[PDB]
Structure formats: C-alpha cells, structure tokens
Amino acid sequence: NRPNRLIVDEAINEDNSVVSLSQPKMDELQLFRGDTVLLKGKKRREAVCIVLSDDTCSDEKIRMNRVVRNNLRVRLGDVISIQPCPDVKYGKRIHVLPIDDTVEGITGNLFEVYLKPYFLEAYRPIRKGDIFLVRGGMRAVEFKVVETDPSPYCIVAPDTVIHCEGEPIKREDEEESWNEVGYDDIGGCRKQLAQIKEMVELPLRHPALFKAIGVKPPRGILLYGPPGTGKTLIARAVANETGAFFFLINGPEIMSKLAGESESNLRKAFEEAEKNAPAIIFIDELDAIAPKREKTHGEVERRIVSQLLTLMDGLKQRAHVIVMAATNRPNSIDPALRRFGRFDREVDIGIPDATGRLEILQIHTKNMKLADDVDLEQVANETHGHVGADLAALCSEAALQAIRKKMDLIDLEDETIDAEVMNSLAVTMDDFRWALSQSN
Amino acid sequence: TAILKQKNRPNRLIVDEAINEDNSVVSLSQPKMDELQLFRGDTVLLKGKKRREAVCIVLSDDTCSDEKIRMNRVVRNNLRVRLGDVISIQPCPDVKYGKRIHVLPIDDTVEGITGNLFEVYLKPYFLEAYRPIRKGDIFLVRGGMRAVEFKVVETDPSPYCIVAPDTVIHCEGEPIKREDEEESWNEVGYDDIGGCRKQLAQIKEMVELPLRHPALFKAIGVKPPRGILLYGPPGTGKTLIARAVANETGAFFFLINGPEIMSKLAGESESNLRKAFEEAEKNAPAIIFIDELDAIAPKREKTHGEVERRIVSQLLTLMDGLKQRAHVIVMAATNRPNSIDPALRRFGRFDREVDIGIPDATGRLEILQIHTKNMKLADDVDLEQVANETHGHVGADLAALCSEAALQAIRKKMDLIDLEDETIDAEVMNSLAVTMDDFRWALSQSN
Amino acid sequence: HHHHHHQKLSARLRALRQRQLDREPDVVVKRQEALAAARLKMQEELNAQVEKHKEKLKQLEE
Amino acid sequence: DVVVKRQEALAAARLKMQEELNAQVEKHKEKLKQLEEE
Ligand SMILES: Nc1ncnc2c1ncn2[C@@H]1O[C@H](COP(=O)(O)OP(=O)(O)NP(=O)(O)O)[C@@H](O)[C@H]1O
Numbered sequence: 003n004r005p006n007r008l009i010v011d012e013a014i015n016e017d018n019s020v021v022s023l024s025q026p027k028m029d030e031l032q033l034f035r036g037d038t039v040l041l042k043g044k045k046r047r048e049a050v051c052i053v054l055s056d057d058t059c060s061d062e063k064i065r066m067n068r069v070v071r072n073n074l075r076v077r078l079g080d081v082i083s084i085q086p087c088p089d090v091k092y093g094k095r096i097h098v099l100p101i102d103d104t105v106e107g108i109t110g111n112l113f114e115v116y117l118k119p120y121f122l123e124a125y126r127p128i129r130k131g132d133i134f135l136v137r138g139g140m141r142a143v144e145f146k147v148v149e150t151d152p153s154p155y156c157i158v159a160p161d162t163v164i165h166c167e168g169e170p171i172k173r174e175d176e177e178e179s180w181n182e183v184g185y186d187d188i189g190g191c192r193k194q195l196a197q198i199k200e201m202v203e204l205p206l207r208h209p210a211l212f213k214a215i216g217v218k219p220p221r222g223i224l225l226y227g228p229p230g231t232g233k234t235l236i237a238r239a240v241a242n243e244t245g246a247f248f249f250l251i252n253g254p255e256i257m258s259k260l261a262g263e264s265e266s267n268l269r270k271a272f273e274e275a276e277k278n279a280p281a282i283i284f285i286d287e288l289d290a291i292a293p294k295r296e297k298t299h300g301e302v303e304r305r306i307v308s309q310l311l312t313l314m315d316g317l318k319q320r321a322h323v324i325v326m327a328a329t330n331r332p333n334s335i336d337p338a339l340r341r342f343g344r345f346d347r348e349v350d351i352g353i354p355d356a357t358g359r360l361e362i363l364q365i366h367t368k369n370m371k372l373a374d375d376v377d378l379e380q381v382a383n384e385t386h387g388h389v390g391a392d393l394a395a396l397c398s399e400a401a402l403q404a405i406r407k408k409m410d411l412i413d414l415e416d417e418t419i420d421a422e423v424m425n426s427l428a429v430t431m432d433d434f435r436w437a438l439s440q441s442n
Numbered sequence: 443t444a445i446l447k448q449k450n451r452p453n454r455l456i457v458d459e460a461i462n463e464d465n466s467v468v469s470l471s472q473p474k475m476d477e478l479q480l481f482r483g484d485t486v487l488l489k490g491k492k493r494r495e496a497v498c499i500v501l502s503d504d505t506c507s508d509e510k511i512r513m514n515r516v517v518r519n520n521l522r523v524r525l526g527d528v529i530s531i532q533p534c535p536d537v538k539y540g541k542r543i544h545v546l547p548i549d550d551t552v553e554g555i556t557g558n559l560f561e562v563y564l565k566p567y568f569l570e571a572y573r574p575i576r577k578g579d580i581f582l583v584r585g586g587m588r589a590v591e592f593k594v595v596e597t598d599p600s601p602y603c604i605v606a607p608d609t610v611i612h613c614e615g616e617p618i619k620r621e622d623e624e625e626s627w628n629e630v631g632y633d634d635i636g637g638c639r640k641q642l643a644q645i646k647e648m649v650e651l652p653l654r655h656p657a658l659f660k661a662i663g664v665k666p667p668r669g670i671l672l673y674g675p676p677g678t679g680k681t682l683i684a685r686a687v688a689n690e691t692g693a694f695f696f697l698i699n700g701p702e703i704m705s706k707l708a709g710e711s712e713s714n715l716r717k718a719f720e721e722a723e724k725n726a727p728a729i730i731f732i733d734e735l736d737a738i739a740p741k742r743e744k745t746h747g748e749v750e751r752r753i754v755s756q757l758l759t760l761m762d763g764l765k766q767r768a769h770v771i772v773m774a775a776t777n778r779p780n781s782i783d784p785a786l787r788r789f790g791r792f793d794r795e796v797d798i799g800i801p802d803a804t805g806r807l808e809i810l811q812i813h814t815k816n817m818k819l820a821d822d823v824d825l826e827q828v829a830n831e832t833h834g835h836v837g838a839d840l841a842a843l844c845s846e847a848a849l850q851a852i853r854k855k856m857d858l859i860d861l862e863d864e865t866i867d868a869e870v871m872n873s874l875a876v877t878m879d880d881f882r883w884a885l886s887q888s889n
Numbered sequence: 890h891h892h893h894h895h896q897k898l899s900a901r902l903r904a905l906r907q908r909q910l911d912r913e914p915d916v917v918v919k920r921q922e923a924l925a926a927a928r929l930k931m932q933e934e935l936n937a938q939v940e941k942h943k944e945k946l947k948q949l950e951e
Numbered sequence: 952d953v954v955v956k957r958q959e960a961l962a963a964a965r966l967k968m969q970e971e972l973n974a975q976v977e978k979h980k981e982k983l984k985q986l987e988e989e
C-alpha cells in the first residue's frame with residue numbers, strides 16, 4: 003500500500019480524458035483540478051489524462067471510463083499507479099487512424115464529423131498508442147493515436163495539426179496486441195515471480211550495484227515444476243515484460259533439426275544474445291536437449307549437450323546475458339548442467355494452493371460471461387491438486403457445457419449464430435459442477 | 443437411494459422445554475392426547491436416544507403445539523435427548539405400585555453429606571406424589587439451600603414402578619461417582635458419527651432390518667446377508683461405528699477384539715471364539731462384531747505359524763456353522779482389506795463389504811462439528827473454512843486437530859496459570875476459548 | 890411306617906400350601922382415588938403456570 | 952495576448968469540464984438518496 007496506487011472504478015461521466023479522484027487524495031498527492039496525470043497500468047501500458055475532483059469517489063479508489071481502462075489494459079477493480087505529468091507539451095502534429103470495422107466507406111469525413119469537434123477547444127491530452135472512441139452522427143468510431151509530435155504524450159490544442167493519413171487499422175492487428183501475456187496473466191506465483199525478477203531483471207538493470215558490493219550475479223536459472231503449472235507461460239511473460247533482448251530456444255525444435263544445424267542454432271542464439279546485450283536467453287524444455295547422458299544412446303545428442311555446456315561456460319561475466327531455462331523433469335537433466343557457473347539457481351513453479359487456484363480461475367474467467375450464482379472461491383476449494391492448465395480447461399469445459407445447454411436454440415448448419423442468443427449466454431455454477439465431475 | 447430416514451407418525455413428537463419444572467411431568471396438547479387415547483395423569487413410556495427410556499406423567503397444556511412435547515431438563519437428560527429432537531411416546535398400562543426401590547446420591551452434589559436425605563430431600567419429594575420412576579433414571583431434588591442428584595439403582599419390580607407411601611426407599615451403598623455417570627453420558631451412538639449417512643444406511647439395512655423383520659425375507663423368498671465387512675484406511679470411523687451400533691441396536695451384541703483374541707494362549711483363543719458364537723446363537727437375535735479382523739485372519743500365506751492357521755479354520759468353521767435360523771449377524775472391520783485371508787470373503791462368509799472411506803468436506807465439517815460441540819469456540823472460528831483447509835483428512839485427524847487447537851489455546855494462557863498449583867483459577871478456566879489462530883497453528887503442525 | 894411315611898409327607902406339603910396361600914376392597918378404592926386426586930393436583934399446579942405464561946406472551950407481544 | 956491566452960483558455964477549458972462533472976455528481980447523489988428509500 004502506497005499513496006499513488008489506487009483501486010480502479012468506473013467514472014460517472016463518459017469523457018475519454020477524465021479521471022475522477024477525491025479532494026483529500028488530490029491534496030495528499032499535491033494535485034490540482036485539471037492537472038495532467040500519468041496513469042501506469044498492466045503490461046507497461048501508460049495513459050495520460052485529466053484529473054478532476056469527484057465527491058462520491060472513495061479516497062483509495064480512482065474513477066475512469068472503459069476507454070481509459072482499456073488503454074491501461076486494466077479492469078474494474080485493479081490497482082493502478084498515478085503520478086503528475088508536469089512536462090506536458092502542446093503537441094505540434096499528431097497522426098491518428100481509424101479502426102477498420104468502426105468505419106466502412108473509410109477516410110471520407112472523419113476529420114470534420116468526428117475528430118475536429120471532439121478535439122477542438124478541449125485541450126485533451128493524448129498518448130501514442132491510445133485508442134479512443136468518438137461519437138458523431140449515429141455511428142461511433144474508434145481512433146488509434148499512431149504518433150504524436152512530440153511523443154509520447156501531448157496536449158492537443160487548436161493549432162496542433164491532425165493527420166488522418168495511412169491505411170485504416172485492422173482489428174486483428176490490435177486484437178493480437180490484447181493477447182500479449184504479462185505477469186498479470188499468471189496466477190499464484192508472486193513468491194517466484196519475485197525471485198525471477200531479482201535474479202534476472204535486477205542484475206541486468208543494475209550491473210553497477212553487484213560489481214560495486216563485490217558480488218557476482220547468478221546467471222543460469224532453472225524453472226521446474228510438474229506440468230501445467232506455468233513455466234512456459236512465465237517465460238512468454240518475462241519476454242513481453244522485460245527490458246532486455248530476449249532469445250527463446252525451444253528444446254524440441256532444436257532437436258527437430260539436422261545433425262549440426264542444431265549446434266548452429268544453439269551458437270547463433272548465444273552469439274545474437276552476447277551481441278544485443280543486456281539479454282535473456284530462455285531454454286524451454288531443457289530436458290529434451292540436455293537429458294542425463296546415460297540415457298541417450300546416440301552420438302549427436304551428446305555432442306549437443308557439450309555444445310550447450312561450452313556456450314554456458316563460454317560466457318564472460320561482462321557479457322550481460324542471463325540464461326533462463328525450464329523443465330518439468332528436473333532430475334532428468336544432465337547433472338553437468340546444474341554445476342557452478344551453469345544452472346546455479348532453481349525455482350520451483352510448484353502446485354498452487356487454493357488461493358493461487360482462485361487467482362488462476364479469476365484470470366481464466368475475466369473474459370467469460372459468468373452468472374450471479376457462480377462461486378469461484380468454491381470451485382477453487384472443490385479443486386485440490388489442480389494446476390493452472392487443469393483449471394483453465396475446467397473453465398473451458400464449463401463454457402462448452404453452457405453452450406451445450408443452448409444447442410436447442412442454435413443450428414450447427416447455420417452460417418453464423420443468432421446474436422441475441424449469444425449476448426444472452428451465461429456460465430452457471432452447474433456448468434462448473436458438470437465440469438468438475440468430468441475432470442474429477 | 444440410501445433411504446432409511448425418519449417417517450412422520452402420531453406417537454413421535456418434537457422435544458421442547460416444559461413450562462413447569464416437575465421431574466415427572468410431560469406436557470401434551472389435548473388434541474394429541476385425544477388422537478392418542480391418553481388421559482390426564484396417565485403413565486407414559488418415552489423412548490429417546492441410545493435405547494434410553496423414561497417413564498413419566500403425561501398432562502395437558504394449552505400453549506403446547508400438536509406435534510411437540512414438553513419436558514424439563516431432567517427428563518431430556520434421561521432420554522439422552524435435547525431441545526428439538528424427536529421422541530417416541532406410548533402408553534404404560536402395566537405400571538405396578540413399587541414395593542422397594544434403591545436410590546443413591548451423586549458424589550459431587552453431596553460434598554459434605556448432611557446424611558439425612560431420606561428425611562430432607564427424598565421423603566418430601568416422593569411422599570404422597572405417586573411419582574413413576576425407572577431404573578437408571580437420574581433425578582434432581584431441592585431440599586434446604588442445596589440441590590441433590592439421585593440415581594435410581596434398582597426398583598422392585600423393575601424397570602419402572604409407581605413410588606407410593608409404602609414403597610420402601612433404600613439409601614444404602616456408596617455415593618455414585620460423577621464420573622461413572624459422565625461415562626454413560628459420553629457413550630457413543632449414531633449422532634457421534636460424521637459423514638457416513640450413506641454407509642450407516644447400508645449397515646442398518648444389512649443388519650438391523652433382517653434381525654428386526656426376518657419374516658419379510660423368508661416371505662419374499664430371499665436370504666439375508668450374514669457376514670458384513672467394514673473397511674477403510676485407518677482413522678475413518680469403523681471401530682466407532684461398531685461402538686455405536688452396539689449402543690443403538692436391538693440385538694444382543696457380542697464384541698470380539700482381534701488383537702485381544704490373539705493375545706491369549708494356544709487354545710484359549712479358539713475357546714473364546716467359540717464362546718462368543720455360542721453366546722450369540724443362544725441370545726439371538728445377535729450381532730457378533732469382529733474388530734481388527736486382519737489380526738486374527740490374515741492371508742494364511744504370510745503367517746508362518748501353526749496355531750494362527752488353526753484359529754482361522756476355527757473362525758471359518760463357526761462362520762459356516764451358522765444355521766440361517768440362528769438369527770446372528772457377523773459384522774467385522776478392518777483397515778487392511780486385501781490382507782484378510784480370501785477364504786473369508788466367500789459366499790456364506792463375509793459376503794458384503796462397506797467402504798468407510800475418506801470423507802468429503804461436508805463430512806469433515808460434520809466431524810469437526812461433533813468434535814467441538816463440547817468445546818469453548820470463539821466467534822472468529824470458521825469451521826467450514828477448516829473443513830476446506832483440511833483435504834484428505836480423516837475423522838481421527840480432525841479430532842486431533844481440534845485437540846491441538848485447544849492445547850494451543852491452553853498454551854496461550856500458561857502465563858496466567860501454574861503447573862505447580864494444585865488445581866487452577868476457575869475465572870481463567872471459564873474465560874478460556876479456542877480462536878481461529880489456534881486452528882491455524884494446529885493446521886500448520888498436521889500439514 | 891415307611892409304607893405310610895411318603896403318604897404322610899405329601900399331606901403336610903399341602904397343609905403349608907393351603908396355610909400360606911390362605912393366611913382388599915377397603916383399600917382397592919383408596920389407592921385409586923388418592924392417586925386420581927394426586928394427579929388432578931399436579932394438573933392444577935400446571936394450569937397455574939400455563940396462564941401465567943399465556944399472559945407473559947401477550948405482555949411480551951405489546 | 953498569446954502565452955497568457957493559452958493558459959487562461961486552458962484553465963477555463965478545464966473548469967468547464969469540472970462543471971459538467973459536478974452537474975452529474977449531484978444528479979447521481981440525489982438518485983442514491985432516491986434509491987435508499989425507494
Ligand atoms: N500460473 C498460471 N496462471 C494462469 N494460467 C495458467 C498458469 N499456469 C498454467 N496456466 C494455463 O495452462 C496453460 C499451460 O501452461 P504452460 O505455460 O505450458 O506451463 P508449463 O508448466 O510449462 N507446461 P509444460 O510445458 O508441460 O511444462 C497456460 O498457458 C495457461 O493457459
């Protein structure tokens with residue numbers, strides 16, 4: 003808990019630049035009505051906004067309409083970080099584009115009928131990669147901010163030039179950006195995420211500090227767990243969240259290649275990392291590359307492991323490269339790899355407690371049409387020894403029951419399906435019981 | 443389903459406190475008395491939990507509901523029931539004027555006996571009242587500033603009588619130890635078993651039902667099952683279920699304890715095995731229960747001993763040597779099912795098997811609830827939570843959790859107490875409660 | 890003598906039987922009336938309470 | 952005119968949002984108190 007962190011809650015008014023706080027909080031924070039504020043949300047995303055004063059707002063909460071939440075990637079009742087933005091320039095020239103489906107017959111009159119009214123004499127702040135929404139005529143239209151002179155944020159004043167030029171932005175390409183995995187799509191691991199950050203991000207971010215107290219960082223890290231726990235996910239997140247250049251080595255993929263091409267790609271990744279450094283090489287499925295040499299009755303397979311050992315070893319401390327790796331079969335990795343200098347530190351991405359199971363379920367239902375009678379906590383308790391995967395697929399099977407309970411109203415032979423019936427569709431508790439009774 | 447459940451009937455009634463505090467007084471509503479063919483101040487047989495009966499004076503009360511019945515503590519205690527149980531009432535038209543009745547007082551309500559009890563307490567109470575009493579009623583009398591509790595030990599004739607002016611009143615013997623009654627109070631019946639309706643139901647219907655209605659089966663041309671086997675892991679409640687079936691059931695019950703039979707000398711075992719089966723055949727309808735069967739009748743392969751095998755044979759031959767008309771059921775129980783000699787689970791022998799398994803969180807709750815009913819629980823205690831926090835836990839485990847909770851709670855007060863005092867400050871005892879954190883501390887020790 | 894002694898013994902077995910099983914109406918009623926009158930006195934001391942409670946109900950609900 | 956113009960036109964622009972918020976706030980406050988009896 004801190005002053006500048008606040009719980010997210012819907013705004014009363016629907017203005018795209020408006021973030022409502024309580025007076026006490028504004029005073030505490032040294033903020034005046036209609037200052038410009040930097041909100042920081044999920045996935046590194048920031049939005050820049052106009053703070054205003056609202057009586058019905060709690061001290062610990064903050065109010066914001068969809069369009070802001072979306073661009074902080076947050077949701078109703080997350081926490082966000084707010085701070086003053088006293089640098090904010092009057093923008094010179096800003097490029098905006100509309101989003102391919104919101105506008106059909108598209109780039110006719112969007113300057114005059116939508117944007118100009120919206121922006122004009124309002125002095126709104128906007129940020130690079132804010133997507134916003136404007137209503138004009140009977141239609142509504144979504145506009146991405148592509149670039150702003152100067153970047154990333156500006157105040158759009160009467161003389162700021164407004165470029166409506168380019169190709170309409172595809173829905174798909176912006177949906178792709180929604181599905182990025184970050185540390186918030188991971189449930190029940192604060193303990194470990196914490197460690198990973200401090201073995202990996204902290205010595206790549208502050209290598210001064212460790213040479214300064216006369217200490218060497220850890221440089222080989224190993225995630226292990228049973229399977230379904232979240233290791234492959236934690237890496238996919240680390241990748242999207244981290245400062246460094248990130249090269250991913252997928253075990254079975256390296257081993258799919260031809261005698262020698264493997265060893266090549268192995269080197270290439272270590273070279274490409276040493277080169278772009280500060281870097282994280284991640285090896286998923288380590289067990290598939292570097293098994294216990296006893297078990298592998300093959301010439302080449304042993305050559306690979308050597309090749310790997312020699313790259314691990316062949317890293318000067320000043321390279322600024324971390325190797326993460328991950329496996330479910332720890333004890334089957336060649337013991338050579340967990341020596342000093344190599345995979346020194348190990349992190350148990352274990353089975354989660356009922357708390358974790360909850361977080362997980364909660365993540366996996368956030369985009370899900372849940373009824374009133376659904377008791378996630380309960381499900382969490384009814385699911386002992388379940389892992390991330392298991393619990394996800396449970397939420398699937400729940401929904402695929404819920405859908406199955408409407409197959410009277412639907413046709414498999416229709417081209418697509420009655421919208422009313424889709425909009426209507428909700429996941430009951432009994433859907434969850436039916437699911438639970440299949441996965442036992 | 444598991445369908446052995448209480449049915450509504452006329453003579454079954456819901457228990458509720460009496461208005462007056464008279465120990466022979468059971469208040470009904472007129473309509474009910476009429477429906478039942480009962481007149482004011484008749485003598486009634488109330489039957490309660492654990493085969494307990496009391497015999498009483500029925501009277502008429504307006505504020506009494508039709509489906510309820512009123513009775514002061516002292517009756518409920520002797521029916522072993524509680525406020526809002528159901529009890530069974532029926533006429534007692536045999537009731538003799540008693541000739542001579544032995545009563546005694548209870549040790550801790552007489553500390554410093556003034557020794558005059560015939561005159562101060564009993565005689566006033568009994569005299570010219572014509573109260574009915576039953577063998578093993580414990581009743582309460584106020585005389586002087588003190589109150590005194592008296593057990594009825596025997597009554598001539600027994601088990602009930604009417605105590606009239608000339609019924610002789612024996613105050614002879616040794617004052618009854620509180621203990622030796624609070625042992626009979628804390629004896630187990632079905633209600634002290636948690637998370638097993640499914641199985642209890644079964645047991646009742648493979649055992650009690652054919653012993654109670656052997657007409658019915660010979661009548662639809664069917665043979666009852668006659669060997670039953672309880673199995674589970676250990677801690678689950680098997681040894682408990684038998685101890686309850688015993689206190690609850692119709693039949694003469696003989697218990698054979700495995701390790702105890704095997705503690706005896708070459709031949710004395712085989713004797714006692716016979717003696718039990720004989721004694722049962724003889725008092726029948728009977729239930730023989732064998733606890734720890736695995737300790738008598740292991741897989742003959744494993745037991746490199748002469749006598750051990752002779753015992754199993756002895757057992758087999760008694761099991762087999764039961765005529766259907768004997769009217770005996772053999773229950774037995776074990777935690778190591780697969781280790782019992784396979785000869786025993788044949789036809790004619792232990793035919794049916796009952797899994798007294800690991801309980802679900804619902805069961806775990808019932809269990810925890812049973813284990814804390816005599817326990818000084820705080821407001822912040824969330825039994826339901828604890829039930830959920832305790833996967834794979836069995837009866838035993840949950841009990842000992844509730845012990846360890848309380849032993850923490852006790853440990854949190856050791857500043858206020860002394861190990862070297864003789865007994866302990868009452869205020870501090872009366873004050874003592876079990877918190878939730880006591881339970882967390884417990885949960886974190888048993889994992 | 891001994892041809893009479895078993896005839897003699899039987900006879901005085903039936904003299905103790907008829908003596909002991911020889912050796913009501915003026916107490917048969919007393920017991921029943923003293924009892925009915927004993928119950929009908931409990932009935933009073935109950936009814937006595939009943940109304941005292943009925944009136945504390947009606948006193949409670951206002 | 953101008954370097955002051957921008958600042959006053961802006962402050963006066965915010966203070967006008969503030970009004971159109973406060974406008975809502977009371978409408979809602981009164982619907983809360985209208986709710987909690989109704
Ligand atoms: N910690 C978690 N939080 C939320 N969802 C999870 C978590 N762990 C697993 N899941 C769900 O299940 C999927 C599979 O997990 P994955 O990332 O492959 O972990 P893993 O343990 O590396 N599996 P494996 O490749 O067999 O070792 C994830 O993408 C999620 O959909």
Ligand SMILES: Nc1ncnc2c1ncn2[C@@H]1O[C@H](COP(=O)(O)OP(=O)(O)NP(=O)(O)O)[C@@H](O)[C@H]1O
Pocket residue numbers: 634635636637638674675676677678679680681682683776777809812836837838839841
């Ligand atoms: N179903 C239950 N309901 C309530 N209490 C239980 C239950 N099961 C076990 N307990 C508690 O655990 C104690 C020991 O259980 P016990 O009756 O010995 O079971 P058991 O399975 O026969 N053990 P074992 O002799 O090893 O097979 C009982 O006295 C209870 O206090």
Ligand SMILES: [Mg+2]
Pocket residue numbers: 680681733734775
């Ligand atoms: Mg046992």
